[PDB]
RNA sequence: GUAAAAAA
């Protein structure tokens, strides 16, 4: 499932050139996402049971 | 499960198995209502959401999703908080909303009917199909389909029901005036017969079942809009079923109603056939609505707005997307519609216009098809066509360039057919044949896997051949990289409509996934057509610069990649403009490869210009050509091309005073740029008759009818023009003549003398021609020269070389001709040639340790040299104490091999420093040619013959010096021994490399077969056992049949069966491939 | 400083004749240089000769020239009144020339000392052994294993490395190649004894980065031995640009079975190119030349995708990237495996 | 926004901003962003509270039925905020809600170059041709 | 560097 969105969100950078910060720190994130995939799943659960804000 | 066309297809499929549909006997009327949900994700409650989410998940869940969508929308100065409707550029807003709309349609439905539809849970419906046919009858809502926010609802009534339903509505709306028709909604792109004027009771029934449905939508939620909705009505009156579905206008007619005997059978119609009696029963007429011409026209406004400033390539690239996904969305319904096709013709040349004012401002008259529909492969742009382009038989005219002469061909001229630019709508299958397609392949997968588990065998590519590009989903989706990941992934679809929420850049194959669906259209087929119908690529290459860069095949023809700026530069902080050219910088190199074709007059009419320091005529202002034109013909290139074909010539006829009994040759210098005026012309080499010549009468150089005239004549002259020429001037035998005769007929122009010949040049196609007079020798004498000076000329180099660096083109290893049969003939020249060997210098040696560990210990090696011409073989031997300390081994053998060879040219005197250098290695041409950029008179090559070195290595006394050797050194030896007073330098190099090769093949049996006999003994100074003359041919045979056999027994070839030639190549090193 | 010859910059060779020292007073001092527009065949020749191979190319010298045009207006009309301005080339001051040098003096040192494969006589011992253990070592190249960790089902791969550092096995040497050809045909017999066939890869996709060039021996059971053509063909068909320069696959199997020999591959791809190959034979097989290399995957993420979807694998050990060690168990037993059939041993 | 905007009031909370914060949170659930300026207090100041004050009403349950002995043992369940307290490797999500943390005795380089750039730049006030014209007076006053 | 006598 997390390899699924993953996947989703690098090809929504595919075609780009020029990187804002933004988007140079999400394709990061992404990668960060492969290396540690538990690590991620752990965060993504915590933030899906705690976080109301955003 | 469905791409939207098979959403289309089974809806029209369901319509038409429904009970008794067509049937209208007893009054009865079928409704067809689409319309849009107005306002929901506006108006979705975020605590009601949160309540119906929590129905369905996890509290945590559905807190999270809420929470999500309430948050702080900002844009530059402005902010809100969204507390109101639900935000469609959420990750899961897809999910969220096909759930509320869910809700929404057991609204709309009511419970048991949606209950009906839907099937039992445990068994439930097939889509369109019911559990058993009064389930079906039972209420008056026969099919209903949800597209996101779009509804569809198909209704029958029979006549008490229709009329109990317009008698509530007239109760409550009354309006007798006749507006409902004057307001009501019809098809205007289906022919006025497929329609016709309105009816009371059938307009009445639209509105009516209008009004129901809108009373069952509570305006707080959602409501249907008059405005949104169409409605169309089957009756007795009206035998058509109107409606529109994701892009296609969609009329259903049935066959007892059509009043035709017989069809005209189209490839663009729907055949829908009952599911129970199994034969043709409807017709379905498809369009593509003018809403979907209008967002393909605003797709390609889109591209030409954000595209003034891209590459051609670019903005070929995104046409090509758009029109593949176009055709291959639309299909039978693109080729239907007329305005679709009048749209993409319009696009087409808008697309074609970009790419020409980009080019140059002016409008011409006539660019080829060549130049925008060649392949990528071949520098065109690759665009693909959905229009009619004719291409004429003045492009598709090519001619080449022989040791004969000129050849023309005029392809197409086989047939008088137009040769068109092909259609993708011709290349790519019908949807209904795609259906049947899919199920048919499928079935044979799934049965071809079970023979292959019978026979408990492989599956073959044989096997999984022919069922290759067919299904939906693809035989190649089961080869694709994922799968367990795509078992996984759902809702793609949904995703992908909601996808326009997140990102900026539209999709046009938003409808398909490649990952799920896989790739739906192929286009070999397409571009191999495209070439045939531009006339094969002798006629492409024609047309391109291809001549003038000098290389031999357009396969092996690699194009560099050339975008990287924006990473590369911007850190320089460029200006808008500055970085909009640098995107445009491929665009030189398209412009240069298609130059030949673009500076024509009949392109470009107008008044042509002359550019500086050239003879080039510029037709129109083309900047970036012209800039690469100054960058190519800089330092004055085309007049010192002009002096040094006139210097070789000169230095030609001075080495052959002896041979055509010429008394002295005179190098005239008064016109340093005559060579590049071109209203008329001097001569350029002056001959005079040491004895009075009769000379022919005016020709062409390869003209075989020579008529020497009676007229005696002293004194002549040769004339060099150069030219560049276009594509359609670039026949330089007539422009030779025509030239010539101008010259000499016209008095401006002063020749010193009245006999003489014009030797004429292309310079952008390699061609040359001479016209004139004739004195014997000319003929044979110029075409040697001209052959060597046009494949050896170094001005000539550096003009190839330059068009090859500003083309970024490589090639492969059918690279610059290497060591071949052709140029091993051609070293025994009088020029001085010499070969230069080093994988014999850096040898390591495999040592065993007490550890039994390996170790790569190095020894001496020797740079091998030598010359062919005297049989010399220099030799430099390079030792351990170099090789010491250092790393990057080989890469440092080859810098140092290059480095002393590069000494030892400089120890060597003007006299004897070689003219040709030929590298056994092919690595070593970058190192050595850095090296001998200070003798860049020397010219530098490699070899595809791999000669035994390693065996004059295995030379014992050679051997044994360099494993004596404890410094360097660099020695000198004789490998002709005495065959150069005896035999030929040929008959000795042959000799050399057969007791070479039999030493490399073996040692033991070629060292007996060279002393057969013990008093033959080898003196001195001579490497070789000395033989006789008929000793020396048997001991030739002898290693001959050797080798022979020793091929034979090694590729398992007969011997018997290799020419004289094929032999010779085994000799000689070459691989040849095998004869059975 | 420190040598620095022409193999280290290529524009350190010899007099630069295609340059002239300018007149003003900053050409003086600065150090500009210019045009040199009367030159000759010796001139233009090691011209040429010296800016082959150049980064970028004529196309980033343009890109020079307009970066340094503050009046540039991106337009046909200043293009043409301006074209003999911008047709001017631009020539580094030996200064910066020189920074160039030692800037890749710099870089190259780090990647040769970094790199696992590379095997020189300098340093001591145990650093002179590569970080890769050793098993079989021929006269220039040499062989050790896959890292961990490997596709599930593949396991026991191996890998042919050449002692120089290349980029491409276009750019190695035919002798490199003749015992690489030699290790090939024992990898495919020790494979065929152990019942499985083998594949083997080349990963030329980033030659930007400078890897050593290693040819991956990858053993496959026999019927996805079989059908292997058609996953690889699918992959290169799919993961590149569309709309690509040039034929997405080139089947130097085909041509090989038509004429070319062993040399389809060497002879069909030009070395300065970005691509991928997998051979099935031992004279073809098939390959692509990477022109996207965003859409391309990362490293050898593109083989071991593909690797798993025949051998259905967890994507977890897909993307992976292995990670070379010095001593290894599986290693050692690869050796004590593959001594029988070690061509290198029959040698010594 | 979080922070150090002047409207925000960082002073504990009382017994009518309480009750009113319970209330909308049962009115309007997990609506932060609207239920914080009905409230007066950012929306990450209310969520905060507001689970603060469920995490003490379940300790007052607990306390009350006297599940737990003494209170010197180390047998209590860690608090939800313990539970939220970080994991080694764990990012704060809200440091922009958090408040400020003293400077220390010795700044690292990145703050005093901040901090001599953020004096550099609320120094100036002109742009380029201002001041070419300043230099180019200068230059002819030396200059006659 | 193209458009006024231990801080390109
Ligand atoms: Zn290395």
């Known amino acids: 499932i997390l390899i699924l969105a993953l996947e989703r969100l690098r090809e929504a950078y595919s075609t780009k050139g020029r990187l804002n910060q933004s988007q140079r720190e999400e394709l990061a994130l992404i990668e960060q996402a492969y290396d540690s995939p538990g690590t991620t799943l752990e965060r993504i659960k915590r933030f899906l049971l705690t976080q109301r804000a955003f | 499960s469905e791409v939207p066309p098979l959403l289309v297809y089974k809806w029209c499929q369901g319509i038409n198995n429904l009970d008794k549909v067509w049937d209208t006997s007893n009054g009865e009327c079928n409704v067809i209502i689409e319309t849009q949900l107005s306002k929901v994700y506006e108006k979705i409650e975020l605590t009601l959401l949160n309540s119906l989410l929590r129905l369905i998940m996890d509290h945590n869940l559905a807190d999270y999703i809420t929470a999500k969508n309430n948050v702080t929308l900002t844009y530059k100065d402005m902010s809100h908080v969204n507390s109101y409707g639900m935000i469609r550029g959420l990750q899961f807003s897809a999910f969220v909303f096909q759930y509320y709309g869910l809700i929404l349609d057991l609204l709309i439905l009511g419970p048991q009917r949606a209950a009906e539809i839907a099937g039992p849970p445990q068994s439930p419906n097939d889509f369109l199909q019911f559990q058993d046919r009064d389930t079906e009858t039972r209420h008056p809502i026969r099919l209903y389909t949800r597209y996101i926010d779009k509804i569809w609802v198909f209704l029958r009534f029979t006549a008490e029901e229709s009329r109990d339903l317009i008698q509530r509505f007239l109760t409550e709306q009354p309006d007798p005036n006749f507006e409902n028709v004057i307001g009501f909604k019809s098809k205007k792109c289906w022919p006025r017969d497929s329609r016709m004027r309105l009816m009371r009771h059938d307009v009445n029934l639209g509105r009516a079942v209008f009004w129901d449905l809108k009373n069952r939508l509570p305006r707080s939620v959602t409501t249907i809009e008059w405005d949104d909705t169409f409605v169309s009505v089957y009756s007795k009156d009206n035998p058509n079923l109107l409606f529109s579905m994701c892009g296609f206008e969609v009329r259903i007619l049935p066959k007892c109603r059509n009043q035709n005997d017989e069809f005209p059978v189209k490839d663009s119609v729907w055949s829908l056939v009952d599911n129970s009696t199994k034969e043709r029963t409807a017709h379905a007429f498809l369009q593509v609505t003018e809403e979907d011409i209008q967002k393909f026209n605003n797709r390609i406004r889109q591209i030409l707005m954000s595209s003034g400033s891209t590459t051609f390539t670019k903005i070929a690239n995104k046409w090509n997307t758009a029109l593949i996904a176009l055709f291959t969305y639309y299909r039978e319904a693109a080729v239907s519609t007329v305005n679709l096709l009048d749209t993409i013709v319009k696009c087409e040349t808008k697309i074609q216009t970009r790419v020409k004012i980009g080019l140059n401002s002016k409008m011409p008259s006539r660019f080829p098809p060549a130049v925008f529909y060649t392949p990528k492969e071949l520098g065109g742009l690759g665009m693909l066509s959905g229009s009619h382009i004719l291409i004429p038989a003045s492009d598709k005219r090519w001619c080449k360039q022989t040791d004969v002469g000129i050849t023309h061909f005029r392809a197409g001229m086989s047939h008088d057919e137009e040769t068109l630019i092909p259609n993708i709508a011709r290349y790519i299958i019908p949807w209904e044949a795609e259906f049947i397609d899919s199920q048919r392949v499928w079935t044979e997968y799934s049965q071809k896997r079970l023979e292959a588990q019978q026979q408990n065998r492989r599956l073959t590519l044989e096997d999984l051949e022919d069922s290759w590009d067919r299904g939906l989903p693809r035989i190649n989706t089961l080869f694709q990289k994922d799968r367990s990941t795509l078992s996984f992934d759902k809702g793609f679809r949904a995703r992908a409509e909601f996808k326009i929420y997140q990102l900026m850049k539209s999709n046009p194959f938003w409808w398909t996934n490649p990952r799920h669906d896989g790739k739906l259209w192929n286009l070999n087929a397409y571009r191999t057509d495209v070439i045939q119908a531009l006339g094969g690529v002798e006629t492409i290459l024609e047309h391109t610069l291809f001549k003038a860069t000098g290389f031999p095949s357009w396969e092996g023809l690699?194009?560099?990649?050339?975008?990287?700026?924006?990473?590369?530069?911007?850190?320089?902080?460029?200006?808008?403009?500055?970085?909009?050219?640098?995107?445009?910088?491929?665009?030189?190199?398209?412009?240069?490869?298609?130059?030949?074709?673009?500076?024509?007059?009949?392109?470009?009419?107008?008044?042509?210009?002359?550019?500086?320091?050239?003879?080039?005529?510029?037709?129109?202002?083309?900047?970036?050509?012209?800039?690469?034109?100054?960058?190519?013909?800089?330092?004055?290139?085309?007049?010192?091309?002009?002096?040094?074909?006139?210097?070789?010539?000169?230095?030609?006829?001075?080495?052959?005073?002896?041979?055509?009994?010429?008394?002295?040759?005179?190098?005239?210098?008064?016109?340093?740029?005559?060579?590049?005026?071109?209203?008329?012309?001097?001569?350029?080499?002056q001959l005079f008759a040491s004895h009075k010549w009769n000379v022919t009468r005016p020709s062409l150089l390869f003209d075989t009818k020579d008529v020497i005239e009676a007229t005696t004549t002293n004194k002549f002259w040769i004339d060099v023009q150069l030219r560049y020429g276009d594509y359609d001037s670039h026949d330089i035998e007539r422009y030779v003549r025509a030239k010539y005769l101008d010259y000499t007929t016209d008095s401006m122009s002063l020749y010193p003398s009245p006999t003489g010949l014009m030797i004429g040049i292309d310079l952008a196609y390699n061609l040359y021609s001479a016209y004139g007079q004739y004195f014997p020798g000319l003929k044979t004498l110029i075409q040697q020269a001209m052959a060597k000076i046009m494949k050896a000329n170094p001005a000539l180099y550096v003009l190839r070389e330059r068009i090859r660096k500003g083309l970024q083109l490589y090639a492969s290893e059918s690279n610059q001709e290497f060591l071949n049969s052709q140029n091993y003939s051609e070293l025994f020249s009088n020029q001085t040639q010499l070969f230069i060997d080093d994988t014999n210098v850096y040898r390591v040696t495999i040592h065993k340790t007490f550890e039994?560990?390996?170790?790569?210990?190095?020894?001496?090696?020797?740079?091998?040299?030598?010359?062919?011409?005297?049989?010399?073989?220099?030799?430099?031997?390079?030792?351990?104490?170099?090789?010491?300390?250092?790393?990057?081994?080989?890469?440092?053998?080859?810098?140092?091999?290059?480095?002393?060879?590069?000494?030892?040219?400089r120890s060597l005197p003007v006299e004897e420093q070689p003219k040709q250098l030929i590298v056994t290695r092919k690595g070593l041409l970058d190192p050595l040619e850095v090296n001998l950029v200070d003798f860049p008179n020397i010219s530098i090559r490699a070899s595809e013959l791999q000669l035994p070195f390693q065996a004059a290595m295995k030379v014992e006394k050679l051997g044994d010096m360099i494993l004596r050797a404890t410094e360097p050194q660099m020695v000198l030896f004789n490998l002709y021994d005495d065959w150069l007073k005896t035999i030929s330098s040929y008959t000795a190099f042959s000799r050399l490399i057969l007791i070479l090769r039999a030493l490399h093949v073996n040692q033991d049996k070629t060292k007996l077969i060279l002393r057969p006999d013990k008093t033959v003994i080898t003196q001195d100074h001579h490497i070789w056992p000395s033989l006789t003359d008929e000793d020396w041919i048997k001991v030739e045979m002898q290693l001959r049949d050797l080798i022979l056999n020793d091929y034979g027994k090694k590729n398992n070839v007969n011997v018997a069966s290799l020419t004289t030639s094929e032999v010779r190549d085994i000799i000689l090193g070459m691989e040849i491939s095998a004869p059975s | 400083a420190i040598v620095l010859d022409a193999s280290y910059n290529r524009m350190l060779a010899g007099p630069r004749h295609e340059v002239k020292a300018v007149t003003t007073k900053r050409g003086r001092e600065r150090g500009q240089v210019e045009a040199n527009e009367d030159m000759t065949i010796e001139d233009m020749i090691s011209e040429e000769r010296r800016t082959r191979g150049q980064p970028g190319g004529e196309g980033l010298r343009l890109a020079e020239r307009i970066a340094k045009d503050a009046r540039f207006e991106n337009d046909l009309e200043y293009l043409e009144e301006n074209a003999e301005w911008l047709a001017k080339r631009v020539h580094k001051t030996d200064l910066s020339l020189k920074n160039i040098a030692v800037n890749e003096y710099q870089k190259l040192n780090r990647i040769l000392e970094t790199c696992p494969l590379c095997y020189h006589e300098d340093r001591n011992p145990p650093q002179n052994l590569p970080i890769a253990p050793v098993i079989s070592l021929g006269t220039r190249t040499y062989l050790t294993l896959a890292p961990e960790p490997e596709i599930n089902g593949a396991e026991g791969g191996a890998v042919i490395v050449p002692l120089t550092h290349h980029t491409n096995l276009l750019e190695c040497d035919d002798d490199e190649w003749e015992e690489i050809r030699n290790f090939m045909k024992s990898l495919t017999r020790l494979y065929h004894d152990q019942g499985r066939d083998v594949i083997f890869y080349e990963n030329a996709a980033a030659p930007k980065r400078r890897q050593h060039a290693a040819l991956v021996a990858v053993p496959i059971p026999y019927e996805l031995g079989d059908t292997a053509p058609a996953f690889f063909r699918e992959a290169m068909l799919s993961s590149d640009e569309e709309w690509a320069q040039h034929r997405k696959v080139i089947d130097t199997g085909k041509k090989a079975k038509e004429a070319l020999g062993r040399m389809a591959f060497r002879r069909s791809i030009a070395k300065e190119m970005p691509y991928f190959h997998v051979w099935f034979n031992l004279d073809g097989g098939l390959g692509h030349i990477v022109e996207d290399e965003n859409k391309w995957p990362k490293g050898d993420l593109f083989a071991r995708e593909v690797i798993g979807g025949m051998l259905d694998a967890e994507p977890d050990v897909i993307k992976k990237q292995g990670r070379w060690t010095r001593s290894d168990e599986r290693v050692e037993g690869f050796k004590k495996r593959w001594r029988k059939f070690d061509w290198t041993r029959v040698l010594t | 926004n979080e922070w150090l905007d002047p409207s925000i009031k960082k002073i504990e909370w009382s017994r009518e901003e309480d009750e009113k914060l319970l209330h909308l949170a049962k009115l309007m659930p997990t609506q932060w962003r609207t239920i914080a300026p009905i409230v007066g207090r950012t929306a990450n100041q209310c969520l905060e509270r507001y689970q603060k004050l469920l995490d003490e009403a379940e300790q007052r349950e607990a306390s009350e039925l006297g599940l737990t002995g003494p209170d010197g043992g180390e047998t209590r369940?860690?608090?939800?905020?313990?539970?939220?307290?970080?994991?080694?490797?764990?990012?704060?999500?809200?440091?922009?809600?958090?408040?400020?943390?003293?400077?220390?005795?010795?700044?690292?380089?990145?703050?005093?170059?901040?901090?001599?750039?953020?004096?550099?730049?609320?120094?100036?006030?002109?742009?380029?041709?201002?001041?070419?014209?300043?230099?180019?007076?200068?230059?002819?006053?030396?200059?006659?």
């Not at chain 2, 091998?864 to 990057?888: D, E, Y």
């Open chain 2, 558 to 685: 690699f194009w560099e990649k050339s975008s990287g700026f924006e990473a590369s530069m911007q850190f320089k902080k460029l200006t808008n403009a500055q970085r909009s050219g640098l995107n445009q910088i491929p665009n030189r190199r398209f412009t240069l490869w298609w130059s030949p074709t673009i500076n024509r007059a009949n392109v470009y009419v107008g008044f042509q210009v002359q550019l500086d320091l050239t003879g080039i005529f510029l037709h129109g202002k083309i900047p970036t050509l012209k800039i690469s034109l100054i960058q190519i013909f800089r330092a004055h290139l085309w007049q010192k091309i002009h002096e040094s074909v006139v210097m070789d010539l000169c230095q030609v006829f001075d080495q052959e005073l002896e041979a055509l009994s010429i008394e002295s040759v005179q190098k005239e210098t008064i016109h340093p740029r005559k060579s590049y005026k071109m209203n008329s012309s001097c001569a350029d080499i």
């Open chain 4, 77 to 144: 369940a860690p608090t939800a905020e313990d539970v939220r307290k970080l994991r080694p490797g764990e990012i704060d999500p809200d440091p922009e809600t958090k408040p400020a943390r003293p400077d220390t005795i010795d700044l690292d380089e990145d703050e005093k170059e901040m901090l001599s750039e953020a004096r550099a730049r609320l120094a100036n006030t002109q742009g380029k041709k201002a001041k070419r014209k300043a230099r180019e007076r200068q230059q002819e006053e030396s200059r006659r």
């Open chain 2, 852 to 905: 039994g560990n390996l170790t790569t210990k190095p020894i001496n090696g020797a740079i091998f040299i030598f010359n062919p011409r005297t049989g010399q073989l220099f030799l430099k031997i390079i030792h351990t104490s170099v090789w010491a300390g250092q790393k990057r081994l080989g890469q440092l053998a080859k810098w140092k091999t290059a480095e002393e060879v590069a000494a030892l040219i």
